[PDB]
Structures are given as structure tokens and as C-alpha cells.
Design a protein around this ligand. Structure first.
Ligand SMILES: CNC[C@@H]1COc2ccccc2O1
Ligand SMILES: [Zn+2]
Ligand SMILES: [Zn+2]
Ligand SMILES: [Zn+2]
Ligand SMILES: [Zn+2]
Lengths: 69, 71
């Protein structure tokens, strides 16, 4: 039904929100510290000097284990 | 249809996976450091001296800003 289509769209958007903002291919699993933006996969986060969201200096990257992984 | 019920269940399970494992009421937004388990809201994470997943000591809690975060 049309309701089935609406739910498919919501599921797709939620799943897309869990993907890396740089490569759009791998799941987010890394946090820029200390700002806390958690928007990249490990490969993309490794090479950034500043947060791509707020421009804060990245002191280090913390790996995150999320239940959604 | 039956597929509407199947999709409702998938959406419910994905949303439940983003809720705190202790209170079951608030969204996850905190990481236990250094183990990295990210399974609690800020209120439950503040009260735990050991990670509830792996029992490693919590040195500190890092707040996480996730694109999935909602109000
Ligand atoms: C994921 N938890 C965020 C919110 C923020 O404001 C809060 C205020 C009072 C109780 C809980 C609260 O939790
Ligand atoms: Zn990436
Ligand atoms: Zn940032
Ligand atoms: Zn909680
Ligand atoms: Zn842990």
C-alpha cells in the first residue's frame, strides 16, 4: 500500500544517516575528539586535521562500537 | 498489507537499537572511554563506573553528536 512506501522511505533515510559523510559508503564508527562529531568511517576520519562539521582541531579519533553496527 | 507490518517491525527495531540500554527511554549520545562502547544516554553513562558491555573501567565519558540525533 502507500503506507508500505512511506515506511520504506523512513527506513532508507535512517540507514543513510548512519553512513560516512565523506565516502557515503561505509558506516560511521569514529568520533572526532574533543568536539564529539561522529560523522565518518575510520579511513576518512584518519586523515582530517579539523572537524568537517565545526572546524575544531582534532586532537584524536575515538573508535565507537554502536548497537546499530 | 503484511509487508506494512514487516516494515513497521524493522523500523521499530532500528529505533530501539538507538535507545539507551540501561533506561530504555532516552537516545544514545555518550561513549565510554577508552573501550568505545556507545550504548547509553548521558544520565545513565554518568552513573556507571564500569562499562555495561565489557566491564572495562570508564576513565571518562565523551558526548557524541550523531547525524541520527532527533528531538
Ligand atoms: C538523550 N538525553 C537527552 C535529554 C536532554 O535533556 C534532558 C532533560 C531532562 C532529562 C533528560 C534529558 O535528556
Ligand atoms: Zn568514509
Ligand atoms: Zn566537530
Ligand atoms: Zn539512559
Ligand atoms: Zn566497553
Amino acid at each position: 500500500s502507500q503506507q508500505t512506501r512511506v515506511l520504506q522511505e523512513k527506513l532508507r533515510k535512517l540507514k543513510e544517516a548512519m553512513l560516512c559523510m565523506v565516502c557515503c559508503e561505509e558506516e560511521i564508527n569514529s568520533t572526532f575528539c574533543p568536539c564529539g562529531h561522529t560523522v565518518c568511517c575510520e579511513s576518512c576520519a584518519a586523515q582530517l586535521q579539523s572537524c568537517p562539521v565545526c572546524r575544531s582541531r582534532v586532537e584524536h579519533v575515538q573508535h565507537v562500537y554502536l548497537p546499530t553496527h
